Amino acid sequence: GTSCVNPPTVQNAYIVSRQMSKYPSGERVRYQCRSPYEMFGDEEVMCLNGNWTEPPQCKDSTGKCGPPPPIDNGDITSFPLSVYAPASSVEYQCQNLYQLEGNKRITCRNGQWSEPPKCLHPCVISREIMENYNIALRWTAKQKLYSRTGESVEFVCKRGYRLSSRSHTLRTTCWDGKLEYPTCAK
């Protein structure tokens, strides 16, 4: 219960202590930054009862940033340079049906990018599940096969069924692929 695995990945650094698959509590992992990066924080990261202590960073001493980080199901809306001046910004776009969460723009400050956004998954609305659970969509308006993250999806029991005594509610919010279905019974 108190050993650790997977020492933190530190960009522009390598580990110079001996690597192993499981680190006992108390083991110290030592990082070194690649030239010409400057280290910030402690060069050693210890395993304390299953959690690592805080890792260092290896940054450009003039505050420049490297390429912006990739994000799942999204991409930047410009050519990715190898080097950005401090205060430069870039922006992201999510793929079709994905929902951007957080600021679409990131900025290079103090040698690191501000937090990029996420692209959250749409939810499948399964015909087969609905059939099996005796439910349908309340608004048969266009053929919505998917909901977007953040959208309410409302179902009804099919003609002649009522909500099963332990069912989820008939209205639920799609979130990052998660849709809770209700069930109805004769």
Side-chain angles (χ1 to χ4, degrees):
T2 60
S3 288
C4 297
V5 293
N6 296 337
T9 310
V10 176
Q11 300 290 307
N12 304 133
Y14 46 94
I15 295 180
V16 298
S17 48
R18 180 169 202 169
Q19 291 195 52
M20 70 187 83
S21 55
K22 190 133 18 215
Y23 299 74
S25 197
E27 196 69 37
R28 305 184 70 85
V29 177
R30 191 186 291 276
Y31 295 80
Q32 185 99 86
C33 290
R34 288 181 185 279
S35 48
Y37 297 103
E38 169 176 3
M39 185 174 283
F40 296 74
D42 202 316
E43 65 188 286
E44 292 183 290
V45 171
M46 276 55 69
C47 174
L48 201 200
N49 301 331
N51 294 156
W52 290 109
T53 60
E54 188 175 346
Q57 291 177 294
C58 284
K59 304 192 290 193
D60 182 283
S61 76
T62 64
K64 288 167 183 35
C65 290
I71 68 169
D72 287 340
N73 304 104
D75 209 351
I76 56 161
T77 53
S78 59
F79 178 83
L81 303 174
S82 73
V83 189
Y84 288 80
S88 293
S89 60
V90 301
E91 293 184 346
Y92 294 84
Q93 218 237 158
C94 296
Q95 292 164 9
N96 182 40
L97 301 191
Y98 283 73
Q99 171 62 48
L100 191 127
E101 176 200 79
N103 198 150
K104 67 185 166 172
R105 178 180 293 184
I106 55 171
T107 303
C108 178
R109 283 187 198 103
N110 296 315
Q112 71 187 67
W113 287 109
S114 67
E115 178 162 35
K118 296 180 223 306
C119 287
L120 298 179
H121 289 78
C123 297
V124 166
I125 302 165
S126 167
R127 250 90 119 256
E128 186 180 94
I129 288 156
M130 289 188 291
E131 285 279 317
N132 281 291
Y133 282 1
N134 305 306
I135 62 180
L137 294 172
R138 177 137 138 186
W139 318 98
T140 317
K142 314 92 172 155
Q143 281 305 239
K144 61 132 68 292
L145 286 175
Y146 282 95
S147 183
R148 299 177 55 92
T149 282
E151 288 182 338
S152 292
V153 176
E154 182 170 346
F155 298 99
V156 286
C157 308
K158 275 187 198 151
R159 143 87 203 105
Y161 292 80
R162 55 82 197 176
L163 199 58
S164 299
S165 68
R166 285 160 181 208
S167 176
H168 280 129
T169 58
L170 287 171
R171 170 181 61 81
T172 195
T173 300
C174 168
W175 194 271
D176 199 18
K178 185 187 85 66
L179 182 81
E180 295 302 305
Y181 290 90
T183 54
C184 307
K186 205 101 209 200

